[PDB]
Amino acid sequence: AGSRLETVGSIFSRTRDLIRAGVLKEKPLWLDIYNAFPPLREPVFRRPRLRYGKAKAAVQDIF
Amino acid sequence: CPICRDQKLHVDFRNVKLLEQFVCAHTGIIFHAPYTGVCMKQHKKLTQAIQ
Amino acid sequence: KNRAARVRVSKGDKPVTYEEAHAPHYIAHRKGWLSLHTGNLDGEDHAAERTVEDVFLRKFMLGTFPGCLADQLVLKRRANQLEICALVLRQLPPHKFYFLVGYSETLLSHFYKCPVHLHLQTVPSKVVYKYI
């Protein structure tokens, strides 16, 4: 059918790959459009860990 | 066995198409009897034949 | 729990006739009477006779037309004649149906000593009211 794993890859990844495997027999619109002008970052899932220890953020205060 | 259930199978040195099945393709070694499942008699027969 | 003349709820696949889907407390409210005769009225006689006759007719008909009876029989009694009316699955060739019509009507006429009519209504498959 498709792949409902949100965590495994980008939608791009899963889609292209599922086509590659010959499972998904029709290319979806947004695919060609995607290939043409892809986003800046791969939209792959990531877990938001809380920082610990001495670590802090990098954000510069504006003065 | 595979070999002795079908009596029309003959183990000779001559049919290579049969013997070929009992050798590895890549490694060129003869399968041991359990891998295939032939009975020890025919496995020995085969080994000699392939020789 | 009252169990009388009920068809219990199954997993939800069970085909159920209009008749079978209505518990006794619905008689004369939603479903009607499978028989009609004068006997049970206030000032009237021989209820018992007609009851036995009825029972025998249901049994007899059920055995005479094996497998082809759709719903329970309808027995109308009018001025000494009984019209039996049945819902029948199409199973037999019309030869067998007419054979059994004639055979029955004559047989029962000579048994109960009154003219007996038989009316067959034919149906593709059991009419389904509910679930399924």
């Binding site: 792949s3 495997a21 499972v23 | 393709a25 890549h26 359990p34 891998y35 | 059920l62």
Partner: protein
């Protein structure tokens, strides 16, 4: 005594005793079995053992263009007819007592390893006949209910794949075994992974993963060395299309954690092209059977480095004492060398 009798349905319902309280709490054993046989199966309208022939029923209405009269068969003719009917019963008993063969998965009474056959077509008409499904684990599972007390659900864990690199697993649970099978199939097709296969037989590189309490450790084999693995992993591999592999599972062998762990692991493979690109170098493969000849597997599309990799005299890598023990011939277990059947 004619009024005293009943319908067949009533009598069978009576005799079978499926609706009793014995069946519900499992108050009786499963080796005790009785069945219902239709008693109208072989009978024809008009047929009786008195031997009559009725114009509309047993025999055609018209013979030679005239109306056949009511007539009766000869004694021996009825003998033959009853012989026929008896032989029919015996034939149906011969058909009934023959039990169809069940292809055995892992063991005879295990459902594990068994094929369910292709999942069902999706609502869009989309059809997978290319997919097979194998059962990994079927389990009777219970829950304590206010009214019923113990309540028994089956839950099955299943995997599908086309052999071409797309496989996935899912779990499904229901009161009836049949029902859970259906559920887990149709659900599996929704979570598919793509497994990158090197040269379409092995994985790309060695994998070691600790998923929860399960450690899988897999090693990449050459072409001839078929599928040496936990039996579940062999099943899943056969579904993916991975033909040559070695995997040792340690810690808890719990089935769901094993297949989750496995898919996680295989998903996270880093292809030779990916490696080529992130390092920006040629990745070159030295076969042993091909000698010193440098087969170039992957080249970094884009700009290649002119910078060599820092040469580390001695690498710092995590080593597994198992592999080291294997390399030096300190694994003496009588269970390891054993000859097994083909993959």
């Amino acid at each position: 005594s004619f009024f005293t009798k009943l319908t067949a349905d009533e009598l069978w319902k009576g005799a079978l005793a499926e609706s009793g309280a014995g069946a519900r709490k499992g108050r009786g054993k499963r080796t005790k079995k009785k069945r219902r046989k239709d008693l109208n199966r072989g009978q024809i309208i008009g047929e009786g053992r008195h031997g009559f022939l009725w114009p509309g029923l047993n025999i055609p209405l018209m013979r030679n263009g005239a109306v056949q009269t009511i007539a009766q068969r000869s004694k021996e003719d009825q003998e033959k007819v009853e012989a026929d009917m008896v032989q029919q019963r015996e034939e149906w008993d011969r058909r009934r007592k023959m039990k169809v063969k069940r292809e055995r998965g892992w063991s005879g009474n295990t459902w594990g390893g068994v094929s369910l056959g292709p999942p069902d077509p999706g609502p869009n008409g989309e059809t997978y006949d290319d997919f097979d499904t194998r059962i990994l684990e079927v389990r009777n599972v219970f829950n304590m209910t206010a009214k019923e007390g113990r309540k028994r659900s089956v839950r099955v864990l299943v995997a599908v794949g086309n052999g071409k690199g797309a496989a996935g697993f899912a779990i499904g649970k229901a009161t009836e075994r049949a029902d859970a099978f259906r559920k887990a199939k149709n659900r599996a097709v929704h979570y598919l992974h793509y497994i990158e296969r090197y040269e379409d037989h092995t994985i790309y590189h060695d994998i070691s993963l600790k998923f929860k309490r399960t450690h899988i450790k897999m090693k990449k084999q050459p072409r001839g060395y078929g599928l040496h693995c936990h039996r579940a992993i062999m099943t899943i591999c056969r579904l993916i299309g991975i033909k040559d592999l070695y995997a040792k599972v340690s810690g808890s062998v719990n089935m769901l954690n094993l297949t989750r762990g496995l898919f996680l692991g295989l998903s996270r493979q880093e292809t030779h092209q990916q490696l080529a690109d992130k390092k920006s170098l040629h990745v070159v493969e030295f076969r042993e059977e091909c000698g010193p000849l440098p087969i170039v597997v992957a080249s970094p599309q884009g700009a290649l480095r002119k910078d060599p990799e820092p040469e580390d005299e001695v690498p710092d890598i995590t080593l597994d004492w198992e592999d080291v023990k294997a390399a030096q011939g300190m694994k003496r277990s009588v269970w390891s060398g054993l000859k097994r059947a083909a993959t």
